């Protein structure tokens, strides 16, 4: 029996008018045209030998406006550059007359969003993702889609939480805020860092298996309970996320009947295995769909 | 190592420009407006409560243009109304000026396509697909969305493949072509229909085992060869489709050095049991990724 559940992404239209080409020098990446201002990744300015360590302050004086090309696939004229954090902000002087109603925030680990992935200022595909406990994402990013940007939509209003940076030798990866800071403790080299251990998104495991019993699959719950409070320092011993509740997670719980805790319990005993059977076609446990996703696309509520 | 396979859509703006809402007495879905013509399933004109086995024929004869009503969130004036088997095809007075360079085509067993989810003429989200053997797709609808289209991209050019219909006992999906027929052997009636049983796209899956080698993980390879046609052989009798390659195949081959047939015996192996190994993080075979995605988000060969 099919869950109904998919790595379902918003509408890309209303991005994809305010993606444009910002080159400089011997490089070239992808910006965000936002009223008159284009967000794009500071390592534009670097030079394309010299990614390693660089001194983006030095690079940044040595800039003028005429030192950056934007292009929308129109040339638009910078008038202003400055640098926030790991983005820079460029004036221009054409506002973008697509630009829809957003907002800037920051997304926290457990939490999905969408992603357009383009190259050359010219969007190629939508995807996505879940932030992980350590702060990269699992996606499908290759050479020139840095820039790319990730958002969430609440109602008409467009939340942009990610611009793509790098890959990391696990091959993951991840970005900036709009505020200029790395998620995580990343910085924007291109040398070795140390990168965090992954952790399941307890959250999103406990929403996995309320959107299995929403499906008839019911056979890993018992009428044991684990307490949050027990759970979380179980948690915190094997590799999972402490667990925090919210209004979504309580919505399942009533359409089921079925109580966290019980699904707490039942990740514990899940953990050291499923001994054969399987949860929605799987054997071990997921935690790349939230209880927001279970809601919207098992029983339409957004 | 995370392979860099993520579920990726084409981005769905210029689909996005083409939806409508399409409402007939009780019923209201979606609509696809190209040109003059608007595409709609045909049971918008069945009665709400009366659904099951529709007579098409007479409801149809029973409609005039004003027993249509097409809007776009606009009011399009219908001017024409006709039936191509399980779709209507309704002209109306105004082209869309946002009409892209399209055609229509068929998907095949094995094949992914995007899909632009829509409720009420407005669209809601987007996700990929493959069809499955048994011509259903595992994808993520609910009441309200009929008329959502699924496509491909060549170029500049989109390709319609598909246009939601139901939903079947057992949580997957089908719907139609722009020819009017159904995928399958399946009828638009809400009524008890046999369904043919599913299988494992091996050209997918022998994809999925090159994308893990070039991901690094190989140890399911070994110089055992198993050909296509005992492969084929032995997939009848296993629920795998029999395999075709393709030139996007054998590109994987040659830039990994392992022959298809390396991997036809691999999955003759695998299928008995991975035997506590894992493959890019699976315990199962993985048939969601065909050649394309692997050559497209590995290689960046398009």
């Known amino acids: 029996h099919h869950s109904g559940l998919v790595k379902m992404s918003h509408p890309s239209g209303d991005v994809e008018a ?3 080409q910002v080159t400089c020098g011997s490089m070239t990446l992808n910006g965000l045209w936002l009223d008159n201002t284009v967000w794009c990744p500071r390592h534009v300015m670097c030079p394309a030998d010299q990614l390693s360590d660089p001194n983006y302050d030095a690079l940044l004086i040595s800039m003028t406006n005429h030192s950056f090309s934007v292009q929308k696939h129109a040339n638009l004229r910078v008038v202003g550059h400055a640098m926030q954090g790991t983005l ?3 004036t221009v002087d054409v506002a973008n007359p697509s630009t829809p109603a957003y907002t800037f925030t920051t997304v926290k680990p457990g939490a999905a969003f969408s992603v357009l992935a383009c190259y050359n200022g010219r969007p190629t595909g939508t995807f996505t993702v879940v932030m992980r ?4 994402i699992k996606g499908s990013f290759l050479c020139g889609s840095c820039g790319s940007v990730g958002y969430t939509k609440e109602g008409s209003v467009i939340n942009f939480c990610y611009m793509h940076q790098m890959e990391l030798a696990n091959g993951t990866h991840t970005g ?5 800071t790395m998620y995580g403790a990343f910085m924007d080299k291109q040398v070795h860092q140390v990168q965090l251990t992954d952790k399941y998104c307890s959250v999103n495991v406990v929403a996995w ?3 299995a019993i929403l499906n008839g699959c019911a056979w890993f719950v018992k009428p044991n309970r ?3 409070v027990s759970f979380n320092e179980w948690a ?3 590799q999972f996320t402490e667990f925090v509740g919210t209004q979504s997670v309580d919505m399942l719980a009533v359409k089921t009947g079925v109580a966290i805790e019980q699904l707490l319990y039942a990740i514990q005993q899940l953990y050291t295995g499923f001994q054969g059977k399987q949860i929605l076609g799987s054997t071990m446990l997921e935690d790349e769909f939230t209880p927001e996703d279970v809601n919207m696309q098992i029983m339409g509520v957004v």
């Not at 406990?133 to 990269?136: G, I, Q, R």
């Open 18 to 20: 305010c993606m444009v």
């Open 88 to 90: 820079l902000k460029l």
């Open 133 to 136: 406990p350590n702060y990269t």
């Open 176 to 180: 900036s805020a709009f505020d200029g």
């Open 209 to 211: 298996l309320y959107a």
């Open 226 to 228: 684990t307490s949050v």
């Open 236 to 238: 915190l011993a094997n």
